[PDB]
Amino acid sequence: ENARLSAFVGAIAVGDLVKSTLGPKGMDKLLQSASSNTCMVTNDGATILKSIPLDNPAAKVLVNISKVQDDEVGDGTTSVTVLSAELLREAEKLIDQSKIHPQTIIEGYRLASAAALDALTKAAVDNSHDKTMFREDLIHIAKTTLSSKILSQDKDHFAELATNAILRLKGSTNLEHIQIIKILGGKLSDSFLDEGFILAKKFGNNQPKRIENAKILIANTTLDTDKVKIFGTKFKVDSTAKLAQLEKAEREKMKNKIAKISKFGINTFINRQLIYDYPEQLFTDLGINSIEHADFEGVERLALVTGGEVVSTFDEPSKCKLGECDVIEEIMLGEQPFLKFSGCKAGEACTIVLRGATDQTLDEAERSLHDALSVLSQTTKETRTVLGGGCAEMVMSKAVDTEAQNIDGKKSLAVEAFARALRQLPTILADNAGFDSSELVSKLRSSIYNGISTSGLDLNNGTIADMRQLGIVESYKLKRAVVSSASEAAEVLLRVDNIIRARPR
Amino acid sequence: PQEVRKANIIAARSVADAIRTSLGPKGMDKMIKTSRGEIIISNDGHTILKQMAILHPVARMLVEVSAAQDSEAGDGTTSVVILTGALLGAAERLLNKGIHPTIIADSFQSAAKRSVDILLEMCHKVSLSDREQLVRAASTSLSSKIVSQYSSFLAPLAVDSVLKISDENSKNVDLNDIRLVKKVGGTIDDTEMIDGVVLTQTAIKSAGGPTRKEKAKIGLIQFQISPPKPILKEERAYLLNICKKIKKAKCNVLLIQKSILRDAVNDLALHFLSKLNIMVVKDIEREEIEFLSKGLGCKPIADIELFTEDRLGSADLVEEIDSDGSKIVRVTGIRNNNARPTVSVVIRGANNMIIDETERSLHDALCVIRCLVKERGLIAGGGAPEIEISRRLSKEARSMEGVQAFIWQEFASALEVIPTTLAENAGLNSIKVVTELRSKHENGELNTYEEHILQPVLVSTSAITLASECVKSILRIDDIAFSR
Amino acid sequence: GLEAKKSHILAARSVASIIKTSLGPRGLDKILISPDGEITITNDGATILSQMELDNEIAKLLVQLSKSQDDEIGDGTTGVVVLASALLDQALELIQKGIHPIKIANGFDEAAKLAISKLEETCDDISASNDELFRDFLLRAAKTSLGSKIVSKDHDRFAEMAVEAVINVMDKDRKDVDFDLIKMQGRVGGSISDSKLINGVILDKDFSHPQMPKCVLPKEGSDGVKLAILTCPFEPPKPKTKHKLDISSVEEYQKLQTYEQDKFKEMIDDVKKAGADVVICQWGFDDEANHLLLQNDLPAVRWVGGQELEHIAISTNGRIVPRFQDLSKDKLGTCSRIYEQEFGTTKDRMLIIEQSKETKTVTCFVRGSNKMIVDEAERALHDSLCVVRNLVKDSRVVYGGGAAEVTMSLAVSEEADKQRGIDQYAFRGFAQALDTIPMTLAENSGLDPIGTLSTLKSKQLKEKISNIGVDCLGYGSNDMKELFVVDPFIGKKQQILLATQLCRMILKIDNVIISGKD
Structure with missing residues (x-):
């Protein structure tokens, strides 16, 4: 005591x-x-x-x-x-x-x-009232930070993109609501502002390029090439073909989890690993879309702007927190496949696409942008x-x-x-x-x-x-x-x- | 509040563990040495706790429990103290777990009622109409006494006396109506039932006393024959009207209560009563005043005006039996339809130590027989009923829920203290004997039957009931204050 | 023979009662003060x-046993000590009844072997259920231990780091993980979101002179990147007797100059034949020593400890060259590349050495904004790596968290009536001792220990046989099987074996002998 x-x-x-x-x-x-x-x-x-x-x-x-x-x-x-x-x-x-x-x-x-x-x-x-006086000061402070940085070439174009990336947030000022997309073989003056969540390495081959009323679900599973390391395990089989049969029996039990995906009322499923052709072919009849290369960062940023959650397991069917997006557009620019997510419910976010001439100019522009936005967004809570x-x-x-x-x-x-x-x-x-x-x-x-x-x-x-x-x-x-x-x-x-x-x- | 209860439990556990060795x-x-220098030696738990002069208030409750143990069941005064201390020892860890004593107290009363039905299912059903088990019950109970060959002769005497007064629905029978009058002389082989009544003293040994009368009336009279006490013819005139009023109701038997104040009967009144053949028996103890008012159906009469004929009993024949150093007066045929006939047996013997222990031995024999009157059936002792209950509570404890589920586990563990003590007092290993009894439990159940060792069911039933309310009342007092 | 048996029970109970309140995720923490002045929680x-320094001979067995439990399991620290105290409390009542102490020790061994066979029938299979359900157990393995800390927000990132690390260091043949093959390193500063899974040794280096590039050239399509480690004291010509070297005047400038540098010109040719890109030594280097190796694009590394050289040779398959004459290119290690990657705002400018091939060792990389957060994350990751080893070694598992102790209690208590003799009571005391863990978890959860224990026993008998444990942390409902909460069976089996082994060594010692201090 x-x-x-x-x-x-x-x-x-x-x-x-x-x-x-x-x-x-x-x-x-x-x-x-x-x-x-x-x-x-x-x-x-x-x-x-x-x-x-x-x-x-x-x-x-x-x-x-x-x-x-x-x-x-x-x-x-x-x-x-x-x-x-x-x-x-x-x-x-x-x-x-x-x-x-x-x-x-x-x-x-x-x-x-x-x-x-x-x-x-x-x-x-x-004190945010009379934003006209605060907006004029926000663009002037951002130009001061651009000193000594390669972004100092044009102050007006870069500060204008950061102005609409702050006052238009109407919410948390964390950088998780700002997506940074950078490509090679372009000019810094060609940068534009986009409010969508942009990926790369487009998913699927025969999948359609236009999806209406898409749903987002987060899960972690491997549907393709299981049993990574088979070395060291004793293999007793009468024939060689029985080795591949064991891998098919393990993936056969995944049909119950795949059936629960269609019961969620979602038209799109997101997975980090790949998917074998048989469970991927069943996604067409059930109207399921397979998104790949979601990594980790982009998963957390997507669930917050869409009002979703992240989980690696299924606790119970028909219980989860799901997001939605109205229109998904698939385009290609800079000789690289791109993805575009739009039409999210209460979606608040923005994406700044910077086109550099090399890899050195991209890392210096991203670090200098976070330091400039952190000072401007500090006045929101101040x-x-x-x-x-x-x-x-x-x-x-x-x-x-x-x-x-x-x-x-x-x-x-x-x-x-x-x-x-x-x-x-x-x-x-x-x-x-x-x-x-x-x-x-x-x-x-x-x-x-x-x-x-x-x-x-x-x-x-x-x-x-x-x-x-x-x-x-x-x-x-x-x-x-x-x-x-x-x-x-x-x-x-x-x-x-x-x-x-x-x-x- | 636990400082008051834990101090009382530890103090009561040391007393129960001390009596447990007996x-x-x-x-x-x-051994208890009184301040006056008297030293007593015996294994009786009721005698030890009475002469110990316990200053602990809660520990004094065991005296009342031991008193009701001998008054109801008649056996187990030591075992009920052991079972009381067994529940107190297991209750020490219950308070450490945060268990409120209400659940502890309520579970003891609920387990005592369920333990009775468990013993009745395992008990053998017997009836009082068969005298085979009734004679062997009192004969084997006397194997702990000096009497051996004479124990078989007194066995049918105790059986026939209880069966007449037991009836069917009478259930509990008052033991005060059974009075054993002991006197030096004679022997055990000479016994007389004398269902009418038996007094505690002899009759007048003076000259002129008839000492025998037929068709007389017996009644309680608190008066005394004495001269005037605020000349020969003056005292005889005062005593003439006293004997004349007694003749009006035709009362030939005068019972005068013993008092050291004045005398009993004057010598001048003996010659007056000799003509009418009126027998007088003096030196009537104060305890016999209530005894004679029950079986005889009479009433105590304080004054001479209160004496009436309607309050007098009836005696067919009143005579004084001639015997060495005895001179016992017997009465037969009281002819009382409403009141049941009393049972009073005269105990005779040469040595004073004979008639003493014999009277105490017959008291325990009548209680065991009386146990079958309230509830028929018997369960062999030696740890059989204590272990049998713990066998059924093993699977039943899993069917409970909440705090009470753990109490059933500790309740069966406290019951094992009784058979463990029996194995220790015999010199055998405690745990080794108990394991051998539970090993054969899968086949045998009650099996001691060939050794002629029997115990009534009321002793095992009352020991659990009295110990349940005892420990229940101990935890009810959370504080002790001085009030005068 | 008199006061020894009574004193050993009270002494071991008072020491074990310290960690009884810290058992489980809801178990409360403690404030430990190191003798150097640092406070650890x-x-x-x-x-x-481990921090306990005491002269009591009974409590010394807890420290010696806990050292071997961290390598084998690591979760048997608090659980075994609490379980061992339950066997001692039940044995104290048997001493007063006349039970021999060795019979109590031998009674716990026979009771433990019978309880293992009971769980073998009720256990469930992982790989037989599905392949991906096994990986889901690895992702949520570290989530339970880290759920009580701020790390529980980013736990999804640290879950995938232990999946690929164990597969590389452990082979399916022996199914064993070595502690020396896991490098645990952490520093103060940064955040926990920058932690990356590296397949090889870190080996933080500033690349000496800044002119050296941050990347290693392939050297005309050469195979991998070869390294050279030297533990030799590479140093000036120090004789065994004279020394005494001094410059008299300017006249000796050109006399001693050309006489020295002409030596190393012979040994540098043997290094270029082998193709070693970087040179690593134990001690520091001079300023001008790395300048001639700069034109040849041969960086050098200095200030490397002796223990750090273990993970460099195993991961990169490199060695330490005794002599440059007979050195060949056969046994020289080859890795993917060596580059420098800045971590957060820290000015140390660490680096990353990758592999891309399966190695025999891994290096854990943990960062945090506080010194305590780093230390708490390193120890929690150690126990998470051992659970993965137990799941691979034994596919059959059972549901713990209070469900295993109740099942083992009802199995021994039911068989106690069938086994007669002295062992009949040895099985009853062993079954009651197993009830201490679910009651302790119930007390540590803020619930009635007796009222909860009676509920777990009723659901496994009248309804059906299943595994339902006590929840220390608030969850949705009971029946952890629905939440897919699994515990390793061999991990719990190792705990009950060490508990009986510890209980015997306490009862087998009836004497305490110790000298004085002078």
Whole structure:
């Protein structure tokens, strides 16, 4: 039990050190040394935790976790430790009243964290308004990155393709939504923009070049040339022809899995390996298309834009997550076969085709493009804020109460306690600012409980006021960064049942 | 709360393990030295637990269980303590697994009811109409006593006495109606049933007493014949009206309760009662006051005005049998249709140690016969019923579900403690003998029959029932507080 | 003879009780602190038991046994120790009853042999069901161990790396995989998506002087790419006595100049006849030493450890040339090519040496953004490679995860009544000891161990005989056979044999003798 107490009582005692320092009106702390003449005073939470020597082996783990927030972003480092300490206060009450492995309680935090992120999205605002001023700055910054790069030949043509490849995304900025197709024997000025998912090495011979209402399924199997290495296995046969009969009997059992493919209502099947002529010929009568050379990367990028999933096995027929594309066009350019996928439901993606004169110009253009798009796409999550002043903090609290309706018997207290920790943020801010936490939070939750609540925490008048009129907002990137860091920080301490005392120095 | 229960279980387990060594005639006897200097030696579990002066509150419950064990079944006072401690020893690991005692307590009561039907199916069905098994039951039970050749003579005496009062649906029969009067002198060969009644004392040995009367009435009278106690003719005048009111109801038998306060009968009243031939028996114990009010159907009479004829019984012949150092008075033909005739047998012998152990030996013989009255049939002892139950519970434990499924596995393991102790007390290897009994279980079942060793079914049935509620009530108390 | 038998049970139980909570995918981790100041957290019991330094003579058998379990199986770390503690707890009750300890040891051996024959009837065939179902087991083999980590998102990439690696190093004749033929190497930095499957040794090299090309020329259609390794201390003329070499003045500039370089001109002709493209040595090189070999397109490699030279000669079929005079081209190794491929943003600029032919060894390539992620991925891949070996060596497999222990329990307990004598109770205690694993998995899953164990026994008797285990991680429903979750039979068979072997060595020692410390 002391293993958890050292990670709870020991962490809360250390966590309460920087807890009162949250906010500009928070408390302060002095750091005293042995000689006492080297001391200093500061409000930094990360400095106080790292400077104070602690023989507690559980406290040293929290120090390494806080370093991730500084390197990734570097904002709100103190808020991560304060929120992580409040999660331990509720988790300690769940354990002592249970004495069951916390890993089950950890599963309740993952389901509750999903509802908190969805509640912040609907109420989120942005500074993206008047895109006409932001679009003119986006093309100018991209031309600066093109310096020293071979792409500097024509800045207007290359920056225009990157402009329509960002604002038209309307979604995640990850590079997995941008396909890079590069060919040889072409000019850089001939590059064009395409919204389709483009392959090479066209599939099939007698297969048609036009497919309407195509479905996408991901699977891994080898239907051609099984038994890769036959050396070393004892072969006892009366005739030589019986050797090939064993390979046909193994592929004969695949007919049940092939029959389940037609039951899925799909006209196209994707496989990484090849397919023998007999199972491929049956695909024509059943209307099944066989796509080859899907590799791995292109498989993951296709399932995300089409809303599909990837699996190497069949768990049960008529259960899966499938994508679709309306029109598939097969053309040929640059003396190489190409493929084109279009008509995807809610498809959001783009493809930039760069034509180089050699292999050296292709690798330098692809690496320089990712560095230029990463800086431009960084402003999407930057400057975007949400309504602050305890409002959004309470919105995450009432969103967990929705999950508290349908819940398991033993998972209810795990989810319900997560909402109590979210309400500890206005309690700490009210105590550090010199106000009554019990009076403000009580009136704050009753108003935000059902509907039409713009109210928030007002520290000037010492009461609950509307934050939209005062103009109090906080960044949305800071919201997700602290919640995701505090959720992973609490898992590290709970997943450790026994903590061995560290070697004293 | 476990600190209160675990401390009581360990304290009760040490007591049960100590009494466990006393099981059987070859068991280890326990010595208890009282503060007054008295030292007793015996293997009886009811005597050890009574004189031990146990200060543990839960451990004192074994005295009440051992008291009801001898009052109902009449045997197994040591075995019921062993079975109680066996369930407490197996319950130590149950609390470590997080099992609530309610499931532990409810499973013991459900298993005790199912264990009865298992024993009845394996038991042999017998009837009380056959005297072959009834005589051999009491004869073999006396092989543990000094009497040997005289045991066969007292066997039909105990059989004919129970069958008359057993009837059919009477079920439990009160044992207080059976009183064995022991007196120095005589021998065992001389026995008289005397179904009417038997007193505990002799009659008046003074001069003038008839000591014998025919067609007399017997009744309880709490009065006493004494001179005035807030001159010769004054005391005789006060005693004349006393004997005159008794003559009004024609009561020739006067039973005066023994009291150290005053005397019983004055010498002047002996000459008055000699003319009317009124027999008087004094020194009536206080315990016999309730006994005489049952079989005789009379009522205790406190004063002289309360004395009436309707409260007097009927006695065909009242005489004093002439015997060496005995002088026992017998009554025959009480003629009571409503009340059943009482059974009182006089025990005679030369040595004082004879009539003592003989009275205790006949008590255990009447209980075993009485076990067949409530439930007919018998199961041979020696670990046969304890192992047979565990054989059926092996496949039945797999048919359960939940926490109770594991209790059936530990319940059969606790039953093996009784046959294991019997093998240890005999010097034989514990496990080696038990394995030989389970090996032949595939063919033989109850087979001890050729050794003339028999045990009633009520002893094995009551031992499980009493131990089930005992342990059940132990886990009910989670705290001990001082209340005065 | 008195307190020894009682103390050995309590001492081995307290040590085994440490890893009982870490068994299974839901088993909780632990914080281990190395004496150098590094904190390590892992769910593998082999790391926890290896770091234990203790003077207790009973717990020393767990460390010596766990060393051989990693090479043979690797999954018998936590499972065997917990199972061995169950046999000791059941044996403690028999000591108080007068049972001889050797009879307890011999009773577990006869009970284990009878339980193996029971699973032989109920086992299922893999290759007889289908050929591609076997490969699906290899893809999901590493998914179970990595499902509790962030790696579980990219697990589909690491699944295809172990399929081709085992086939090359293992032949279907002996069906054995050597630990020395698998090179496990990892570094800090990068991501886990850049991990590639290499058919040969990595041998990271910066190609010395930058003027050397990043690719090896075919040398006019020559066969493969030939390499030359030299472990000789290639070095100046150091005699055995004098030394003492110094330049007096400028007058000695041309005197000692032409007297030296004329030597190596004889030995360089023998190297060109063999066609060795690259020279590899154990220690470093001078600055001007590689300049004359640059005009001939002959790169050189320096700073190579002694252990790294094992995977270079086996994969590329090369050797180490004793002398250049008699060196021929017959035994010189030939590979596909040697090129340099940058990995992520790391400035080390590693390289890739391919083969295109089946070799006798492979090299595992694992990367990660954290030092802990790399170490956790290397140990999880080791156990995944051993499961593939067990599936090829034994086609018949059974369903584990709590289903195998319940089946072995009902088989021994049913046959216990048919076998009389002292072994009758030895079979009952052995059957109750096997119930510890499914109850431990039930406790580690946050469920009633007794309530769950009674359910698994009821479904395998009144309904039909099948394999239904306890789920430590949340799944859709029971009956893992529908989810195609398989465990190697010979892997589980090796665990129950080492468990009985460990339990005997504990009971066979009745005395503890140790000296003092001075």
